[PDB]
């Protein structure tokens with residue numbers, strides 16, 4: 001699991 | 017899941 005904080009994060013950092 | 021590539025991403029971007 002991770003999506004409770006993970007949207008994406010690859011160059012753009014986490015947006016939520 | 018996203019943990020297979022998620023280590024973080026909040027300030028540093030994704031490292032895994």
Ligand SMILES: [Zn+2]
Pocket residue numbers: 002005006007008009014018022023024025030
């Ligand atoms: Zn992430």
